[PDB]
Symmetry: C3
Subunit: 146 residues, 3 copies
């Protein structure tokens, strides 16, 4: 069982899945409430905003997962998991904002981006540590001989 060091990342991943499923069900009820039957992704602006919120989130979702894992494995699991929650939480506000007003989406989008960029930075710092000693070591072997 090599699970222990990874269960926080996996559980935030699962919260992310539930959240995405939440958005998807919301599109189904807005699909019914405004008579917009499949296919067709157009209708009144209330519907379109809800469609687009869902689509937007589901497009950043893999970015989120990728960096969440790389940051959690290469930097620190708990911090990664923590930005993970901010991110997910900001994205819940993004969706709820977007639905009432397109302008009211902007505040939680900006919060979602900070969290997400933090994961990226952590990931980048994590990989730098892994890789940079090994390669500075041998860059210094050029200069021998000597």
């Amino acid at each position: 069982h090599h699970k222990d060091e990874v269960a926080l990342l996996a559980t935030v991943t699962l919260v992310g899945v539930l959240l995405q499923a939440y958005f998807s069900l919301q599109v189904i009820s807005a699909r019914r409430a405004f008579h917009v039957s499949p296919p067709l992704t157009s209708g009144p602006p209330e519907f379109e905003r809800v469609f687009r919120a869902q689509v937007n989130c589901s497009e950043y979702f893999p970015l989120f997962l990728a960096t969440l894992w790389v940051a959690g494995i290469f930097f620190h699991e708990g911090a990664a998991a923590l930005c993970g929650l901010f991110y997910l939480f900001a994205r819940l506000r993004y969706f709820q904002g977007y639905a009432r007003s397109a302008q009211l989406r902007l505040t939680p989008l900006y919060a979602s981006a900070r969290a997400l960029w933090l994961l990226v930075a952590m990931a980048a710092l994590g990989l730098l540590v892994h890789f940079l000693p090994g390669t500075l070591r041998t860059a210094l072997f050029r200069w021998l001989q000597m």
Copy 2:
């Protein structure tokens, strides 16, 4: 080689990839058959249904992968892999249905959702086992002293 305990999850993942690529090629031929040249995602309803089937699947695809892995790692690899196949198979019927009729998409969608929700439940049960003993143990440490 820590591959052994994970190869079923990886191979279902690969079936999922081939399946998504299958859908994508189908959109290319429907793009040609109805003269709908990039960009533009609109045309006759036969084309639109095929475009939307592909888009729908490719939106649930990461959810699928995430839960497939978490369920396979934290609950049981073979069962996860098994819902994985039902899911993938249901999604193949979803796509083939949607293309002929939008109503004929509904039966395999409902099957895809059951499989997918099963993976989620398995994942949730898996994480509960990992986390809940550790935390009940120490919740019981509050009540000592004693």
Copy 3:
């Protein structure tokens, strides 16, 4: 630290994330330059091409990641990481092409597909090795007795 055998896959994954974020920022500036304010995903053809490039890439992105990991784990990490870069690089040209001309997207798309199909083949070959000995062995146990 079981990081060492996986850091190349993780770092290409991170390049992929930065690249996707690059595309997303490009859509934001084309959204401003042609006054196409959220929601609405339609406008002049310059804008639509840029929207679609981003969407296209972000749809293949999970396929890419999945096969990149399975190929890197089950076949060989460095080769997988190498197709990974070709793929990512081809996808950068795809996006830059698509934006100026829809026809000028085709050359880097074709390069992105070769790289991606190579990862799939490598993955398929990797899983074959894992699975096929174990099962030929026991297929040969049918024919004993003997």
